[PDB]
Homo-oligomer: A and B are copies of this chain.
Amino acid sequence: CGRFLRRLLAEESRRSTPVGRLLLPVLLGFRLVLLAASGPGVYGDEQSEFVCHTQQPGCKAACFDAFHPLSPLRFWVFQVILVAVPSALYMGFTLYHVIWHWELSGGAGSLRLLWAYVAQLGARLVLEGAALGLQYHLYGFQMPSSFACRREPCLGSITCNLSRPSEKTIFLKTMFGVSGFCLLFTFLELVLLGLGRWWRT
């Protein structure tokens, strides 16, 4: 109902600044729409785009497995669903609070909702920071055009060629930047609540 949805939206964002109320939800929606609309077109065919110059049985599959143990499409899907877990717990906690206080009326509980809001921002700051570090460790900042392989069952060292290294590099840097701004604005919303006044005190 409108009267109910209108009271729920005012309670979920009563102790937030505009950074947490407007800017963060739009940035996270931007990231998801970009991944769903453009992701499969850039990285979906990476296996048939990895051509090695050989005919020995089993050497091609051994070299591709050593180059990419995990696809970026699978990495990014895990990041967006894990980062959504603290927000879904907080929104469910807020819904049951509004239900079990409507029948009563329709302080001690207002201070419980603030501690839950600080806890999910802190968890999102830790999860977002670990993901950026893993992305740099797994993929770097560029996709090369060739790759040298000396994995068994290959005889000697073989050269393999990759397709579309420019478009894949452009998409990798864009995702780093979009996630980097999500981390900065999560950190800033904790400062405007008083993270500074807690550290040195």
Which A residues contact B (CB, under 8 angstroms)? Answer: 1-4, 6, 9-10, 13, 18, 21-23, 25-26, 29-30, 33-34, 37-38, 41-42, 47, 49, 51, 53, 57-58, 61-62, 64-65, 68-71, 73-74, 77-78, 81, 85, 88-89, 92-93, 95-96, 99-100, 102-103, 145-146, 161-167, 170-171
Contact = CB atoms under 8 A, between A and B. Distances in A.
Contact of A167 (B13, B74, B78): B74
A97 to B, nearest CB: 11
29 contacts: A1-B1, A10-B100, A21-B96, A22-B89, A22-B93, A23-B89, A26-B88, A29-B88, A30-B81, A30-B85, A37-B77, A38-B74, A38-B77, A41-B73, A42-B74, A51-B61, A57-B161, A61-B145, A61-B162, A61-B164, A65-B163, A65-B164, A65-B166, A68-B167, A70-B166, A70-B167, A70-B170, A71-B167, A74-B167
A81 B161 contact: no
A99 B11 CA distance: 11
A4 B161 CA distance: 59
A163 B22 contact: no
Contacts of A4: 2, 6
> Chain A interface secondary structure, helix, strand, loop or mixed?
helix
A50 to B, nearest CB: 11
Given A57-B53, A62-B145, A10 B73 contact: no
A124 to B, nearest CB: 15
Given A34-B78, A78-B34, A102-B6, A13 B65 contact: no
A26 to B, nearest CB: 5
A3 B6 contact: no
Contact of A163 (B2, B3, B37, B61): B61
Contact of A26 (B23, B58, B92): B92
